[PDB]
Amino acid sequence: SLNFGKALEALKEGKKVSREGWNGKGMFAYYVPGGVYKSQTDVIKNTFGEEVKYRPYLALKTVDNDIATWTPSVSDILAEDWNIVE
Amino acid sequence: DSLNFGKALEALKEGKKVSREGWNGKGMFAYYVPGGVYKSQTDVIKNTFGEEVKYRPYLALKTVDNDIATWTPSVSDILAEDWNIVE
Amino acid sequence: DSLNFGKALEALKEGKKVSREGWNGKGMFAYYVPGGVYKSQTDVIKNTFGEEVKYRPYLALKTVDNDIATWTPSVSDILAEDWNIVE
Amino acid sequence: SLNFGKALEALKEGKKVSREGWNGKGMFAYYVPGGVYKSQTDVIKNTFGEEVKYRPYLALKTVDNDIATWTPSVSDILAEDWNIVE
Numbered sequence A, D: 001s002l003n004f005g006k007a008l009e010a011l012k013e014g015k016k017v018s019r020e021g022w023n024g025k026g027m028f029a030y031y032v033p034g035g036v037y038k039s040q041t042d043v044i045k046n047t048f049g050e051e052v053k054y055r056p057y058l059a060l061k062t063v064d065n066d067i068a069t070w071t072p073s074v075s076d077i078l079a080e081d082w083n084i085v086e
Numbered sequence B, C: 001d002s003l004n005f006g007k008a009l010e011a012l013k014e015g016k017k018v019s020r021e022g023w024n025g026k027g028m029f030a031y032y033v034p035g036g037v038y039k040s041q042t043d044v045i046k047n048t049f050g051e052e053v054k055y056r057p058y059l060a061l062k063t064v065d066n067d068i069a070t071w072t073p074s075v076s077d078i079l080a081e082d083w084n085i086v087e
Protein backbone atom coordinates (compact mmCIF):
# COMPACT_ATOMS: atom_id res chain seq x y z
CA SER A 1 0.00 0.00 0.00
CA LEU A 2 1.58 3.17 -1.36
CA ASN A 3 1.39 6.85 -0.60
CA PHE A 4 0.17 9.23 -3.28
CA GLY A 5 3.71 10.09 -4.40
CA LYS A 6 4.29 6.54 -5.61
CA ALA A 7 0.77 6.37 -7.05
CA LEU A 8 1.58 9.57 -8.96
CA GLU A 9 4.76 8.11 -10.49
CA ALA A 10 2.69 5.05 -11.47
CA LEU A 11 0.09 7.30 -13.13
CA LYS A 12 2.74 9.15 -15.14
CA GLU A 13 4.12 5.81 -16.38
CA GLY A 14 0.69 4.80 -17.66
CA LYS A 15 -0.54 2.54 -14.86
CA LYS A 16 -3.95 2.43 -13.13
CA VAL A 17 -4.29 3.12 -9.38
CA SER A 18 -6.99 2.98 -6.73
CA ARG A 19 -7.39 3.41 -2.98
CA GLU A 20 -8.48 0.77 -0.47
CA GLY A 21 -10.33 3.47 1.48
CA TRP A 22 -12.61 4.51 -1.40
CA ASN A 23 -16.31 3.96 -0.67
CA GLY A 24 -17.11 2.79 -4.19
CA LYS A 25 -15.47 -0.47 -5.27
CA GLY A 26 -13.78 -1.46 -8.51
CA MET A 27 -12.78 2.11 -9.45
CA PHE A 28 -9.41 3.23 -10.76
CA ALA A 29 -7.71 6.40 -11.96
CA TYR A 30 -5.38 6.81 -14.93
CA TYR A 31 -3.40 9.45 -16.84
CA VAL A 32 -4.40 10.91 -20.22
CA PRO A 33 -1.77 12.81 -22.27
CA GLY A 34 -2.30 16.27 -23.71
CA GLY A 35 -2.53 17.10 -27.38
CA VAL A 36 -3.60 19.40 -30.20
CA TYR A 37 -6.81 19.44 -32.25
CA LYS A 38 -8.00 21.66 -35.09
CA SER A 39 -10.59 24.41 -34.69
CA GLN A 40 -13.45 23.33 -36.92
CA THR A 41 -15.67 26.43 -37.05
CA ASP A 42 -14.75 30.09 -37.40
CA VAL A 43 -16.63 30.62 -34.13
CA ILE A 44 -14.22 28.20 -32.45
CA LYS A 45 -11.37 29.55 -34.59
CA ASN A 46 -12.00 33.05 -33.21
CA THR A 47 -12.30 31.95 -29.57
CA PHE A 48 -9.32 29.56 -29.41
CA GLY A 49 -7.27 30.22 -32.55
CA GLU A 50 -6.78 27.87 -35.48
CA GLU A 51 -5.49 24.89 -33.46
CA VAL A 52 -5.98 24.20 -29.77
CA LYS A 53 -3.51 22.69 -27.31
CA TYR A 54 -5.04 20.80 -24.37
CA ARG A 55 -3.18 19.80 -21.22
CA PRO A 56 -2.86 16.25 -19.89
CA TYR A 57 -5.38 15.30 -17.22
CA LEU A 58 -6.49 12.44 -14.96
CA ALA A 59 -9.60 10.26 -15.35
CA LEU A 60 -11.58 7.94 -13.07
CA LYS A 61 -13.51 4.80 -14.03
CA THR A 62 -16.51 5.25 -11.71
CA VAL A 63 -18.85 2.70 -10.10
CA ASP A 64 -21.31 3.51 -12.91
CA ASN A 65 -18.70 2.29 -15.43
CA ASP A 66 -18.37 5.68 -17.13
CA ILE A 67 -15.31 7.96 -17.20
CA ALA A 68 -15.11 11.15 -15.14
CA THR A 69 -12.41 13.78 -15.12
CA TRP A 70 -10.78 13.37 -11.78
CA THR A 71 -8.90 15.39 -9.17
CA PRO A 72 -7.76 13.62 -5.99
CA SER A 73 -9.39 14.83 -2.79
CA VAL A 74 -7.25 15.95 0.14
CA SER A 75 -7.97 12.60 1.79
CA ASP A 76 -6.78 10.90 -1.43
CA ILE A 77 -3.63 13.05 -1.45
CA LEU A 78 -2.79 12.27 2.17
CA ALA A 79 -3.71 8.56 2.15
CA GLU A 80 -1.27 5.67 2.24
CA ASP A 81 -3.59 2.91 0.96
CA TRP A 82 -2.95 3.28 -2.80
CA ASN A 83 -2.51 0.18 -4.96
CA ILE A 84 -1.56 -0.31 -8.60
CA VAL A 85 -4.37 -2.00 -10.53
CA GLU A 86 -3.76 -4.66 -13.20
CA ASP B 1 -21.70 40.86 -13.56
CA SER B 2 -21.30 39.86 -9.88
CA LEU B 3 -23.11 36.52 -10.11
CA ASN B 4 -22.90 33.79 -7.52
CA PHE B 5 -21.77 30.33 -8.55
CA GLY B 6 -25.31 29.05 -8.91
CA LYS B 7 -25.90 31.57 -11.68
CA ALA B 8 -22.50 30.92 -13.22
CA LEU B 9 -23.31 27.20 -13.15
CA GLU B 10 -26.64 27.76 -14.95
CA ALA B 11 -24.68 29.72 -17.55
CA LEU B 12 -22.14 26.90 -17.91
CA LYS B 13 -24.88 24.31 -18.45
CA GLU B 14 -26.44 26.58 -21.12
CA GLY B 15 -23.14 26.62 -23.02
CA LYS B 16 -21.83 30.04 -21.99
CA LYS B 17 -18.32 31.06 -20.93
CA VAL B 18 -17.78 32.29 -17.38
CA SER B 19 -14.98 33.80 -15.32
CA ARG B 20 -14.26 35.47 -11.99
CA GLU B 21 -12.95 38.98 -11.32
CA GLY B 22 -11.04 37.49 -8.36
CA TRP B 23 -8.99 35.03 -10.40
CA ASN B 24 -5.27 35.85 -10.42
CA GLY B 25 -4.74 34.98 -14.08
CA LYS B 26 -6.58 37.27 -16.49
CA GLY B 27 -8.39 36.60 -19.75
CA MET B 28 -9.40 33.10 -18.64
CA PHE B 29 -12.81 31.49 -18.86
CA ALA B 30 -14.47 28.17 -18.04
CA TYR B 31 -16.98 26.25 -20.17
CA TYR B 32 -18.97 23.02 -20.23
CA VAL B 33 -18.22 19.99 -22.41
CA PRO B 34 -20.95 17.35 -22.92
CA GLY B 35 -20.45 13.68 -22.26
CA GLY B 36 -20.40 11.03 -24.93
CA VAL B 37 -19.36 7.58 -26.08
CA TYR B 38 -16.29 6.58 -28.10
CA LYS B 39 -15.29 3.14 -29.39
CA SER B 40 -12.20 1.60 -27.80
CA GLN B 41 -9.09 2.34 -29.88
CA THR B 42 -6.92 -0.73 -29.20
CA ASP B 43 -7.39 -4.28 -27.99
CA VAL B 44 -5.47 -3.33 -24.84
CA ILE B 45 -8.11 -0.66 -24.25
CA LYS B 46 -10.88 -3.17 -25.00
CA ASN B 47 -9.47 -5.49 -22.33
CA THR B 48 -10.04 -2.79 -19.70
CA PHE B 49 -13.06 -0.87 -20.97
CA GLY B 50 -14.97 -3.23 -23.25
CA GLU B 51 -16.14 -2.26 -26.72
CA GLU B 52 -17.35 1.24 -25.82
CA VAL B 53 -16.38 3.91 -23.33
CA LYS B 54 -18.99 6.30 -21.93
CA TYR B 55 -17.52 9.55 -20.59
CA ARG B 56 -19.32 12.05 -18.40
CA PRO B 57 -19.70 15.76 -19.11
CA TYR B 58 -16.93 17.87 -17.64
CA LEU B 59 -15.71 21.44 -17.27
CA ALA B 60 -12.77 23.05 -19.09
CA LEU B 61 -10.66 26.16 -18.50
CA LYS B 62 -8.94 28.31 -21.13
CA THR B 63 -5.81 29.18 -19.14
CA VAL B 64 -3.47 32.17 -19.27
CA ASP B 65 -1.20 29.99 -21.46
CA ASN B 66 -4.17 29.81 -23.91
CA ASP B 67 -4.24 26.01 -23.65
CA ILE B 68 -7.18 24.03 -22.26
CA ALA B 69 -7.15 22.39 -18.84
CA THR B 70 -9.78 20.22 -17.25
CA TRP B 71 -11.23 22.24 -14.45
CA THR B 72 -12.98 21.87 -11.12
CA PRO B 73 -13.99 24.97 -9.11
CA SER B 74 -12.15 25.62 -5.89
CA VAL B 75 -14.12 26.22 -2.70
CA SER B 76 -13.32 29.91 -3.05
CA ASP B 77 -14.65 29.74 -6.62
CA ILE B 78 -17.82 28.05 -5.37
CA LEU B 79 -18.41 30.63 -2.59
CA ALA B 80 -17.51 33.76 -4.63
CA GLU B 81 -19.99 36.34 -5.89
CA ASP B 82 -17.83 38.01 -8.56
CA TRP B 83 -18.66 35.71 -11.50
CA ASN B 84 -19.44 37.07 -14.95
CA ILE B 85 -20.54 35.77 -18.34
CA VAL B 86 -17.85 36.20 -21.00
CA GLU B 87 -18.63 36.95 -24.65
CA ASP C 1 -35.28 16.45 -3.02
CA SER C 2 -33.60 16.39 -6.47
CA LEU C 3 -32.00 19.84 -6.26
CA ASN C 4 -29.25 21.06 -8.52
CA PHE C 5 -26.01 22.31 -7.00
CA GLY C 6 -27.09 25.94 -7.16
CA LYS C 7 -29.93 25.15 -4.78
CA ALA C 8 -27.73 22.96 -2.61
CA LEU C 9 -25.21 25.82 -2.49
CA GLU C 10 -27.89 28.30 -1.36
CA ALA C 11 -28.79 25.81 1.36
CA LEU C 12 -25.14 25.48 2.42
CA LYS C 13 -24.74 29.26 2.69
CA GLU C 14 -27.91 29.40 4.83
CA GLY C 15 -26.39 26.90 7.27
CA LYS C 16 -28.19 23.74 6.19
CA LYS C 17 -26.80 20.23 5.68
CA VAL C 18 -26.84 18.75 2.18
CA SER C 19 -26.08 15.42 0.52
CA ARG C 20 -26.42 13.56 -2.77
CA GLU C 21 -28.35 10.37 -3.51
CA GLY C 22 -25.54 9.46 -5.94
CA TRP C 23 -22.76 9.47 -3.35
CA ASN C 24 -21.27 6.01 -2.76
CA GLY C 25 -20.92 6.43 1.01
CA LYS C 26 -24.24 6.76 2.84
CA GLY C 27 -25.32 8.89 5.78
CA MET C 28 -22.90 11.69 4.82
CA PHE C 29 -23.62 15.39 4.58
CA ALA C 30 -21.77 18.61 3.78
CA TYR C 31 -22.05 21.95 5.60
CA TYR C 32 -20.62 25.47 5.59
CA VAL C 33 -18.16 26.86 8.13
CA PRO C 34 -17.71 30.66 8.39
CA GLY C 35 -14.37 32.38 8.16
CA GLY C 36 -12.70 34.15 11.02
CA VAL C 37 -9.54 35.47 12.65
CA TYR C 38 -7.33 33.80 15.25
CA LYS C 39 -4.24 35.15 17.00
CA SER C 40 -0.96 33.46 16.13
CA GLN C 41 -0.12 30.72 18.65
CA THR C 42 3.69 30.75 18.64
CA ASP C 43 6.48 33.12 17.69
CA VAL C 44 7.38 30.74 14.86
CA ILE C 45 3.83 31.21 13.58
CA LYS C 46 4.12 34.99 14.04
CA ASN C 47 7.25 35.00 11.89
CA THR C 48 5.23 33.62 8.96
CA PHE C 49 1.73 35.00 9.51
CA GLY C 50 2.12 38.14 11.62
CA GLU C 51 0.07 38.81 14.72
CA GLU C 52 -3.27 37.62 13.31
CA VAL C 53 -4.41 35.03 10.80
CA LYS C 54 -7.57 35.56 8.76
CA TYR C 55 -9.09 32.34 7.42
CA ARG C 56 -11.74 32.10 4.72
CA PRO C 57 -15.04 30.26 5.02
CA TYR C 58 -14.88 26.66 3.88
CA LEU C 59 -16.97 23.53 3.41
CA ALA C 60 -16.89 20.39 5.57
CA LEU C 61 -18.05 16.80 5.09
CA LYS C 62 -19.25 14.39 7.77
CA THR C 63 -17.79 11.18 6.30
CA VAL C 64 -18.86 7.55 6.57
CA ASP C 65 -16.21 7.23 9.31
CA ASN C 66 -18.20 9.93 11.21
CA ASP C 67 -15.15 12.22 11.28
CA ILE C 68 -15.02 15.62 9.57
CA ALA C 69 -13.08 16.26 6.38
CA THR C 70 -12.58 19.51 4.54
CA TRP C 71 -14.54 19.23 1.37
CA THR C 72 -14.66 20.54 -2.17
CA PRO C 73 -17.36 19.32 -4.60
CA SER C 74 -16.26 17.18 -7.49
CA VAL C 75 -17.30 18.11 -11.01
CA SER C 76 -19.86 15.31 -10.86
CA ASP C 77 -21.11 16.80 -7.58
CA ILE C 78 -21.36 20.22 -9.22
CA LEU C 79 -23.27 18.91 -12.28
CA ALA C 80 -25.61 16.52 -10.40
CA GLU C 81 -29.33 17.08 -9.83
CA ASP C 82 -29.89 14.60 -6.98
CA TRP C 83 -29.05 16.89 -4.05
CA ASN C 84 -31.19 17.02 -0.93
CA ILE C 85 -31.39 18.97 2.32
CA VAL C 86 -30.65 16.80 5.37
CA GLU C 87 -32.34 17.30 8.74
CA SER D 1 12.24 22.17 -8.82
CA LEU D 2 10.38 19.14 -7.50
CA ASN D 3 7.46 17.04 -8.60
CA PHE D 4 4.38 16.84 -6.40
CA GLY D 5 5.53 13.60 -4.76
CA LYS D 6 8.49 15.36 -3.16
CA ALA D 7 6.35 18.40 -2.35
CA LEU D 8 3.92 16.02 -0.61
CA GLU D 9 6.64 14.49 1.58
CA ALA D 10 7.73 18.04 2.44
CA LEU D 11 4.15 18.94 3.41
CA LYS D 12 3.83 15.89 5.68
CA GLU D 13 7.07 16.90 7.44
CA GLY D 14 5.68 20.34 8.17
CA LYS D 15 7.27 22.42 5.42
CA LYS D 16 5.72 25.06 3.13
CA VAL D 17 5.63 24.58 -0.66
CA SER D 18 4.66 26.58 -3.73
CA ARG D 19 4.75 26.32 -7.51
CA GLU D 20 6.67 28.53 -9.93
CA GLY D 21 3.80 28.23 -12.41
CA TRP D 22 1.15 29.69 -10.08
CA ASN D 23 -0.41 32.91 -11.40
CA GLY D 24 -0.56 34.56 -7.99
CA LYS D 25 2.80 35.28 -6.35
CA GLY D 26 3.99 34.81 -2.79
CA MET D 27 1.55 31.98 -2.01
CA PHE D 28 2.35 28.74 -0.22
CA ALA D 29 0.58 25.59 0.97
CA TYR D 30 1.07 23.75 4.25
CA TYR D 31 -0.24 20.78 6.23
CA VAL D 32 -2.57 21.01 9.24
CA PRO D 33 -2.94 17.97 11.55
CA GLY D 34 -6.27 16.47 12.56
CA GLY D 35 -7.71 16.48 16.04
CA VAL D 36 -10.66 16.22 18.41
CA TYR D 37 -12.90 18.95 19.85
CA LYS D 38 -15.87 18.84 22.22
CA SER D 39 -19.47 19.23 21.12
CA GLN D 40 -20.65 22.37 22.90
CA THR D 41 -24.42 22.30 22.36
CA ASP D 42 -26.88 19.43 22.54
CA VAL D 43 -27.81 20.32 18.95
CA ILE D 44 -24.19 19.68 17.95
CA LYS D 45 -24.02 16.79 20.43
CA ASN D 46 -26.93 15.09 18.65
CA THR D 47 -25.59 15.66 15.13
CA PHE D 48 -21.93 14.69 15.71
CA GLY D 49 -21.84 12.94 19.10
CA GLU D 50 -20.19 14.20 22.26
CA GLU D 51 -16.71 14.76 20.77
CA VAL D 52 -15.79 15.23 17.13
CA LYS D 53 -12.74 13.94 15.29
CA TYR D 54 -11.58 16.02 12.32
CA ARG D 55 -9.16 14.85 9.64
CA PRO D 56 -5.90 16.58 8.71
CA TYR D 57 -6.12 18.92 5.74
CA LEU D 58 -4.07 21.30 3.58
CA ALA D 59 -4.19 25.12 3.61
CA LEU D 60 -3.06 27.87 1.23
CA LYS D 61 -1.83 31.37 2.12
CA THR D 62 -3.51 33.29 -0.73
CA VAL D 63 -2.53 36.54 -2.49
CA ASP D 64 -5.09 38.27 -0.24
CA ASN D 65 -3.05 37.14 2.80
CA ASP D 66 -5.87 35.01 4.21
CA ILE D 67 -5.96 31.22 4.62
CA ALA D 68 -8.02 28.98 2.35
CA THR D 69 -8.57 25.25 2.57
CA TRP D 70 -6.71 23.89 -0.38
CA THR D 71 -6.80 20.96 -2.78
CA PRO D 72 -4.15 20.81 -5.55
CA SER D 73 -5.50 21.10 -9.07
CA VAL D 74 -4.64 18.47 -11.67
CA SER D 75 -2.09 20.89 -13.12
CA ASP D 76 -0.62 21.24 -9.60
CA ILE D 77 -0.53 17.45 -9.21
CA LEU D 78 1.22 16.91 -12.55
CA ALA D 79 3.65 19.85 -12.35
CA GLU D 80 7.38 19.62 -11.75
CA ASP D 81 8.03 23.22 -10.66
CA TRP D 82 7.44 22.83 -6.90
CA ASN D 83 9.78 24.51 -4.42
CA ILE D 84 10.07 24.37 -0.65
CA VAL D 85 9.47 27.79 0.91
CA GLU D 86 11.47 29.12 3.87
Ligand SMILES: Nc1ncnc2c1ncn2[C@@H]1O[C@H](COP(=O)(O)OP(=O)(O)OC[C@H]2O[C@@H](n3cnc(C[C@H](N)C(=O)O)c3)[C@H](O)[C@@H]2O)[C@@H](O)[C@H]1O
Residues within 6 Å of the ligand: A021, A022, A023, A024, A025, A027, A060, A062, A063, A068, A069, A070, A071, A072, A073, A074, A075, A076, C022, C023, C024, C025, C061, C063, C072, C073, C074, C075, C076, C077
Ligand atom coordinates in the same frame (compact mmCIF):
# COMPACT_ATOMS: atom_id res chain seq x y z
N1 LIG E 1 -18.97 9.77 -9.96
C1 LIG E 1 -17.68 10.37 -9.67
N2 LIG E 1 -17.27 11.45 -10.34
C2 LIG E 1 -16.11 12.02 -10.09
N3 LIG E 1 -15.31 11.54 -9.15
C3 LIG E 1 -15.66 10.45 -8.44
C4 LIG E 1 -16.86 9.82 -8.69
N4 LIG E 1 -16.94 8.77 -7.85
C5 LIG E 1 -15.84 8.75 -7.11
N5 LIG E 1 -15.05 9.76 -7.46
C6 LIG E 1 -13.74 10.09 -6.93
O1 LIG E 1 -13.11 8.99 -6.76
C7 LIG E 1 -12.45 9.07 -5.40
C8 LIG E 1 -13.01 8.19 -4.49
O2 LIG E 1 -14.34 7.82 -4.81
P1 LIG E 1 -15.37 7.65 -3.52
O3 LIG E 1 -14.60 7.54 -2.24
O4 LIG E 1 -16.22 6.43 -3.74
O5 LIG E 1 -16.38 8.98 -3.56
P2 LIG E 1 -17.83 9.22 -2.79
O6 LIG E 1 -18.03 8.17 -1.73
O7 LIG E 1 -18.99 9.30 -3.75
O8 LIG E 1 -17.60 10.66 -1.96
C9 LIG E 1 -18.66 11.52 -1.47
C10 LIG E 1 -17.97 12.93 -1.32
O9 LIG E 1 -16.85 12.83 -0.70
C11 LIG E 1 -15.64 13.24 -1.69
N6 LIG E 1 -14.48 12.41 -1.37
C12 LIG E 1 -13.33 12.84 -0.90
N7 LIG E 1 -12.48 11.83 -0.72
C13 LIG E 1 -13.09 10.72 -1.05
C14 LIG E 1 -12.48 9.30 -0.99
C15 LIG E 1 -12.77 8.52 0.29
N8 LIG E 1 -14.21 8.41 0.45
C16 LIG E 1 -12.18 9.23 1.50
O10 LIG E 1 -12.94 9.82 2.32
O11 LIG E 1 -10.93 9.24 1.70
C17 LIG E 1 -14.37 11.08 -1.47
C18 LIG E 1 -16.12 13.03 -2.89
O12 LIG E 1 -15.43 13.80 -4.01
C19 LIG E 1 -17.59 13.39 -2.77
O13 LIG E 1 -17.87 14.72 -2.91
C20 LIG E 1 -12.72 10.55 -4.93
O14 LIG E 1 -11.57 11.34 -5.51
C21 LIG E 1 -13.81 10.83 -5.45
O15 LIG E 1 -14.02 12.29 -5.65
Ligand SMILES: Nc1ncnc2c1ncn2[C@@H]1O[C@H](COP(=O)(O)OP(=O)(O)OC[C@H]2O[C@@H](n3cnc(C[C@H](N)C(=O)O)c3)[C@H](O)[C@@H]2O)[C@@H](O)[C@H]1O
Residues within 6 Å of the ligand: B022, B023, B024, B025, B061, B063, B072, B073, B074, B075, B076, B077, D021, D022, D023, D024, D025, D027, D060, D062, D063, D068, D069, D070, D071, D072, D073, D074, D075, D076
Ligand atom coordinates in the same frame (compact mmCIF):
# COMPACT_ATOMS: atom_id res chain seq x y z
N1 LIG F 1 -8.22 32.42 -3.29
C1 LIG F 1 -7.92 31.00 -3.39
N2 LIG F 1 -8.65 30.09 -2.76
C2 LIG F 1 -8.40 28.80 -2.86
N3 LIG F 1 -7.39 28.37 -3.59
C3 LIG F 1 -6.60 29.23 -4.25
C4 LIG F 1 -6.83 30.59 -4.16
N4 LIG F 1 -5.88 31.20 -4.91
C5 LIG F 1 -5.10 30.27 -5.43
N5 LIG F 1 -5.53 29.07 -5.04
C6 LIG F 1 -4.94 27.77 -5.36
O1 LIG F 1 -3.67 27.91 -5.32
C7 LIG F 1 -3.12 27.21 -6.54
C8 LIG F 1 -2.57 28.10 -7.46
O2 LIG F 1 -3.10 29.41 -7.34
P1 LIG F 1 -3.32 30.22 -8.77
O3 LIG F 1 -2.57 29.56 -9.89
O4 LIG F 1 -2.87 31.65 -8.60
O5 LIG F 1 -4.98 30.24 -9.04
P2 LIG F 1 -5.86 31.20 -10.06
O6 LIG F 1 -4.95 31.88 -11.04
O7 LIG F 1 -6.76 32.15 -9.33
O8 LIG F 1 -6.74 30.08 -10.97
C9 LIG F 1 -7.95 30.37 -11.71
C10 LIG F 1 -8.65 28.96 -11.86
O9 LIG F 1 -7.82 28.08 -12.27
C11 LIG F 1 -7.62 26.95 -11.11
N6 LIG F 1 -6.23 26.49 -11.15
C12 LIG F 1 -5.83 25.27 -11.44
N7 LIG F 1 -4.51 25.18 -11.38
C13 LIG F 1 -4.03 26.36 -11.07
C14 LIG F 1 -2.53 26.70 -10.89
C15 LIG F 1 -1.85 27.29 -12.12
N8 LIG F 1 -2.56 28.48 -12.53
C16 LIG F 1 -1.87 26.28 -13.27
O10 LIG F 1 -2.63 26.47 -14.26
O11 LIG F 1 -1.12 25.26 -13.25
C17 LIG F 1 -5.13 27.20 -10.91
C18 LIG F 1 -7.94 27.57 -10.00
O12 LIG F 1 -8.36 26.66 -8.85
C19 LIG F 1 -9.06 28.52 -10.41
O13 LIG F 1 -10.30 27.97 -10.44
C20 LIG F 1 -4.37 26.50 -7.18
O14 LIG F 1 -4.45 25.17 -6.49
C21 LIG F 1 -5.32 27.26 -6.89
O15 LIG F 1 -6.63 26.58 -6.86
